[PDB]
Design a protein around this ligand. Structure first.
Ligand code: HEM
Ligand code: HEM
Ligand code: HEM
Ligand code: HEM
Lengths: 128, 128, 128, 128
């Protein structure tokens, strides 16, 4: 667990950073800005899948201020809304995980579009 | 990959932060500071193993300054030494991973001691 | 031996009290309620093993009443059943003792579950 | 350990009872009231040796009243005196343990005389 609040903040920020980087490699393939390689897309989606579970466990009470957090207070006051956004994200990643297993480009591109929306959706209401 | 150098620096710092947190949970169990659970020890060990590969790819040329990096210059001037320290870490992680597979407390405690030593070993020569 | 019946009753009650306390320390470790230590688990298991032989010699004829005994009459009328319950307990303790020797958490947890069952089993039919 | 004070009291009283009983079997041999048998004397002294360590760990703060304790307050207020008596007892039991190993009657009789005095010595100042 986290000894101090700052530990939680740093942990979640670190998780989102890793997720962003690996998810980005798959998105580049989907956008045609990088050659498509099923094995590599699979590896990266696998990483995103494993990491996606992590950051959401570090939003406990008391982790609201300090260590440069960009989490809006609404994360807590509207816990219901936050739970929903997290759920959408989880669902989308499941689709991305499956798509990754099949190696089908069209499916992967569709899943990254969905997942990406899940990131933005949550960010609009709870970040910055 | 990493568009800018700072991306690499933030990537590696975040990876270490996650590794530290999850390795710490296994460590606590092995040092008698928390109840032992083979499943949880196993899960945390899996995370460490997976993540251990990640940060070592983010030490390319030019990632020596900025983004509050704590990597000593020796990381580049003493490249061989660094690859030497990284190799030890890898071996230690392979043992920790094997221990996780067996669920054997003694084996796990032995491997966390070795891994810990590999962390500090590298840190002494290349960090801060 | 026991001069008076009461001596036998107090002897067996005291033995059970010590067994309960030391078995409980092993149990706590196995149920994830306390940090695991193979040496301490081993020591406590040794005590339980040694003491387990003791109380079963203090159930001779005439020790059925007085000194606040909680042994049901069935202990004597259903002698075979009692020897049956005691035999199971003994076997369970032999396994707990063997587990203590190996230091294997899984093996220990398995044996504490069996021993526990042997305690309650006998208690249901012959205690209170 | 002990969840409640009464647990400590019951534990130590139970330990002294077992000790008293087994020590008594050796004393009877030494007094010639029972035939001398080196093996049996050895077994019993071994039990006394193992058990002798136990009761002294259950005299913590707060275990002074209730559950029918016969421990005089001096046990705590004159902690120094209590520590001494316990030390004499420990030393005597060591002698009894050795004597038991040698199977020499004269040595055993001497050790039981010493140990017995250790019981009485401590009892006079700290019990009832
Ligand atoms: C979707 C896969 C996704 C991405 C991509 C993403 C990225 C991201 C980054 C890079 C950060 C910055 C980390 C840093 O400061 O170094 C960040 C921060 C937050 N995010 Fe995000 N994010 C994605 C998904 C989600 C989801 C689904 C939610 C909400 C359910 C969410 C929330 C947040 C919050 C809040 C932060 C700030 C955390 C903090 O600074 O304390 N993101 N995200
Ligand atoms: C071993 C399992 C291990 C742990 C644990 C560990 C932790 C760790 C942390 C927490 C950081 C701080 C990151 C931050 O500032 O947010 C960190 C940083 C560096 N480490 Fe380390 N580290 C472990 C292992 C290793 C090994 C085996 C090496 C070298 C081969 C190594 C190196 C470094 C370096 C350099 C940094 C600084 C990164 C930067 O700031 O740019 N670590 N480590
Ligand atoms: C198994 C390891 C086990 C435990 C633990 C256990 C505990 C226990 C306690 C604490 C008592 C109370 C003593 C007191 O009142 O001070 C107690 C009493 C009895 N038990 Fe028991 N017991 C364990 C095991 C067994 C087994 C396997 C049997 C039967 C074959 C058994 C029987 C009894 C009986 C009878 C009593 C009452 C003794 C009396 O009051 O005269 N127990 N037990
Ligand atoms: C020496 C081998 C020894 C014997 C024998 C002995 C016996 C004994 C008995 C039987 C009791 C009664 C237990 C009960 O209530 O059922 C008893 C109680 C106490 N003793 Fe004792 N005792 C022996 C040794 C020692 C030694 C060396 C000390 C002190 C250093 C000591 C102390 C006590 C105390 C105090 C009690 C009362 C505990 C309580 O009721 O809380 N004894 N002893």
């Amino acid at each position: 667990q986290f000894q101090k609040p700052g530990d939680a903040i740093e942990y979640r920020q670190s998780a989102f950073t890793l997720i962003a980087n690996h998810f980005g490699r798959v998105a580049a393939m989907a956008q045609g800005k990088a050659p498509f390689d099923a094995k590599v897309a699979a590896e990266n989606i696998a990483l995103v899948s494993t990491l996606s579970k992590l950051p959401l466990t570090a939003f406990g009470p008391g982790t609201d201020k300090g260590h440069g957090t960009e989490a809006k207070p609404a994360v807590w006051s509207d816990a219901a809304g936050f739970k929903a956004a997290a759920d959408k994200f989880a669902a989308a990643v499941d689709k991305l995980d499956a798509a990754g297993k099949t190696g089908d480009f069209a499916q992967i591109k569709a899943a990254v579009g969905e997942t990406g929306g899940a990131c933005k959706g949550c960010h609009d209401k709870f970040k910055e």
